[PDB]
Symmetry: D2
Subunit: 358 residues, 4 copies
């Protein structure tokens, strides 16, 4: 494969990329198709992810994390999603949405208690941001009622970060908590095998020690990670685009023959060029925004920008891959398009830009 | 506030600011007049020289800045932001001519030609004795060039304006990039000394190909500057004129602009690392050029009726942007990707 | 539904559209999901299509046909495909690909024999456009195979092309040497029975020797129907999404509606125009290919947009937006390189 | 030229098309480049247009009109714009915006007075939609104050249909009316040679006999023409797309690159005839008397955006030559852009369609 431009990100990130790629190719790619058809996450991967050392990329090394940044995590997300977008999505919700939320907003006691098992992979994590859920203080404990829809890793999550109205607070939920239950997992068009379901809270008793950050200050807790976390998830669309090229490039080689129609080769090369450029332009944009996050710089418009841009590019590139293979497309290109659409599912960028320039 | 920060380091951030301040005060006021008169303001050459931007990638030993292509691209960007025409002329001089002599010239050739080119006393262009006959069309800075790098079949040559047999035709009347002097080069029994042969005889294809990449990357700053100029106009205008659809249009301009910058900067940085590659060079100029043209149309659209008046610069931005687009880039990228993945 | 522009096509065509639309709504749409799920054509529809009088739209009235044109047939195809693209494809292969070929290229004896049962729906028809035929006195001997044939497993009558340079034949299910393979389980167009045709020393009488663009234009009704189905889903949804807590989202949704509306009706205008040109007998080679390519691609993008507009609700495998995408994709595959043919025609003509 | 699909529109419309095409080829096309360069309308064309009988396409024959429909007029607009987009725009503002408004909303006396000279080309007409202009009844006369911007044929117009506020009302204005004046004509990016300027009203005295339709019901007069205006003027983008093909197809002949050019040619051909199909259909609907508010906006929106993008492709196909002012590709791009701006922007057009579609399905 030679459709990846080098961004000179340093030996450590390039080693991370290569490590994840070899793992994904041997342990993820062979079960990608079966995962989509059966609509089931292969649960054995969680412990393997842990031993690979990728479930806590941006988590402190004191809890078993790698102590790396969002650029590194985005690329780990990319290479995993490249083999399977569904598994990539589940991985992202765990290692980025859940773990990094506890990492950033958790008390020292909360980090020491919940992070080690999440980073090792013995526990699966989830995040329920988006009010359908209300929390009520009752002396020593909190009482939660309401629901949360469309939660990745919902059915399997042992630890869940959940937002509820008090005006907003965040809580750490354990699977074993009384009053907490999960409904039947969704049967989706794409991202099949990424277990998604409804969370149900009926008089759920949550200890005060499980309150995440300050009470009434949940929106800033939401806002805190959301920009940085959303950038990591842009690795999903990046991975799908990589997968598109993984299919098309060898296909163009197999199809280059004397019996090939007079002009189909040159048109295929032009299609390849557009895919190549779109892929690496998206990477450039996302990586830059991720690197800006690592520098601690505000990236609100560009974070949203790079996710929007890359998500749409992935969808259109998947369609171009299907178009390019024609009749012959057995191939996973159908899955790539279906998967891409979920990430795609502007005024915020424009509104903030307008208000900043007043 | 439509510029994302890419953390490019203190020296490059200092260069950008230096070039920006010069462009705003010394270039921008003359932008409209340059397009109208279809004439380059010749006084800028010495001012560019004194600014120290005509030899960005040239060695400090010849008066150059000794910086890289990322720095040069950004200088190109900020200049083109004030005037795309002048930016184009600047790029042809500082990159097409100067960097070619820098890379492929013998120590004596550099010592002879670079100092005056970097100072701005000479204008540069890119197209026992040697006799060159024939012609070259569409040469930027052609009518004014004192020193010219020219490719011929035997090879690359250094041509001086005073050489017998060398002449220039009437400058072009273009849709855009007006004031960027472009003309035909004419060679009729032109006598060129053997000492003016550039690099090795028969190895001119490697010389030509080498510079093309750096050209595509540095000149990609052109479209970047034009897109910046689009935002420079539209953002204050929408305030003077909140609606939901306009904010979406603004968002697209903003995102496209910074995505283009990200790609171009990365390729430029790759060149500085020596990881230079043909398809990504071709890729980022192709990408940014197409984006610039479409954004110019959107800039015109955003100003409405006023955007369609020659008083406002949006009309010029569209006309300027189209030249950078002027199949070959996509076929080069596809062919290159194919052969690497065989 | 108010996303259909009126093209003033006349009382007879408008009556056809309304009749087929009412039939599709009552008899096709309710089984659309089950048809896709089970990958089986509901065989009872053939006789119902027959009694409706739509299996011989371009067939002579003397054999039970409607005696109408390709514009009319395209629109019947559209309204059926609107309810189910799979059923539309099967209907198109029968009433258009098979019947109209026999109508146009069949001898009077061949028409009187094969058309009546096809038009009534008692017989199912198919077209097979790797196969060799050899003249041997009174009979023809066919050997080879034909892949990806719609209505293949159920076809009683098949129009088949073979190499000699090329000739067409009318094949009966009962012909010795003729057999059909297991039907395909495809990603989309599920419930449109498709299979391989197999010819091993197949004996065909000389009396069954027979004698595409116009027919290809009618099939553009498929994508048109799919786009119509996209709007059928999206327009009521935007109403449901219009709420008190909403949201800048409403205005953007309406703009999205406008684009879908324009794309849909522009596609119809182009396809209908080419269809009408076919009825006039005017050469339409580049324009036939143009409108099929254009509408097919538009259908796929609109299916993606329909998924986009419904959000989470659109992303469940239960909903028909998933089906629209799968169906649309097959039409774009079958209509494709296509552009180079058109350009070549324009260049060589000039 | 073999890049036109035939729509079987009948002998009368085909006869009109051929007549206008042959005229445009001989009398308009040679003057296109010079018209753009000088930023001046060739005034001799008005009388020539008149004798050709195309200034009153949808006007009654009793006033010298052709008594034809909007489909015919759209095609006249197309073939003229094909030779010169600037001249096409001026022609459209005169023959459609002004003349058809007087035809539809004028009293018998108003039609008998103003139409003959407009249709003959002796008078130039204009329409001023866009409030900024106020009118006050003073017995026998009206007194107008305010201004109207961006008026095609403004500097040259002898007769102008103007909309004003009463608390909206429409009026027929003559150049000689006291208080009426015009500012210096615009220096535009494109449509150069289509004279555009500001109208200025300073105590402009207008007779009561020049009031168009009913007072206070000017919005209905305005909305009425806008629909028909968008459809006929859609011939502009159609003509520009036709002009793109007129340039590119012969050029590729004179010149693995060949295969890519053919694919580009195909896209241009398909986009062109798809646009025609849509616009012609909406025009035919207008002739049937079938109101099509969203479809009128729809077909102009569609064709205008297609024309601009095709112009960019035309420039690209000619390469270096396409970027030279000698060649017409530069002008086509500059001209096409106005239609995306004019007669309401693309934004207003999409929202008009969406809003209308939403309320019908309520
Ligand atoms: Ca009949």
């Amino acid at each position: 494969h030679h459709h990846h431009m080098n961004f000179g990100l340093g030996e450590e990130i390039e080693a991370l990329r290569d490590t994840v790629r070899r793992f994904a190719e041997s342990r993820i790619a062979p079960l990608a198709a079966e995962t989509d058809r059966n609509n089931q996450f292969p649960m054995h991967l969680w412990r393997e992810f842990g031993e690979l050392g990728v479930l806590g990329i941006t988590a402190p090394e004191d809890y078993g994390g790698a102590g790396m940044g969002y650029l590194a995590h985005c690329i780990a997300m990319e290479e995993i999603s490249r083999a399977s977008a569904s598994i990539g999505l589940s991985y992202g919700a765990h290692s980025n949405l859940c773990v990094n939320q506890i990492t950033r907003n958790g008390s020292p006691e909360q980090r020491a208690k919940y992070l080690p098992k999440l980073i090792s992979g013995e526990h699966v994590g989830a995040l329920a941001m988006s009010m359908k859920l209300a929390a009520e203080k009752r002396g020593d404990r909190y009482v939660l009622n309401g629901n949360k829809m469309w939660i990745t890793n919902g059915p399997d999550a042992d630890v869940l970060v959940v937002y509820a109205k008090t005006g907003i607070s965040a809580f750490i939920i354990e699977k074993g908590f009384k009053g907490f239950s999960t409904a039947q997992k969704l049967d989706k068009l794409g991202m099949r095998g990424s277990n998604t379901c409804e969370l149900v809270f009926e008089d759920c008793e949550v200890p005060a020690e499980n309150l995440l950050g300050t009470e009434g200050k949940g929106v800033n807790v939401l806002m805190s990670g959301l920009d940085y976390e959303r950038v990591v998830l842009a690795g999903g669309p990046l991975g799908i685009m990589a997968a598109c090229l993984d299919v098309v490039v060898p296909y163009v080689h197999e199809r280059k023959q004397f019996d090939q129609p007079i002009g189909e080769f040159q048109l295929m090369q032009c299609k390849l060029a557009d895919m190549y450029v779109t892929f690496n332009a998206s990477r450039a944009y996302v990586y830059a925004v991720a690197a800006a996050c690592d520098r601690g710089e505000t990236t609100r418009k560009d974070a949203a920008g790079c996710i929007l841009y890359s998500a749409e590019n992935a969808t259109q590139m998947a369609l171009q891959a299907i178009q390019s293979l024609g009749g012959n497309g057995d191939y996973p290109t159908g899955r790539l398009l279906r998967d891409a659409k979920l990430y795609e599912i502007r005024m915020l960028i424009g509104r903030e830009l307008f208000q900043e320039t007043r």
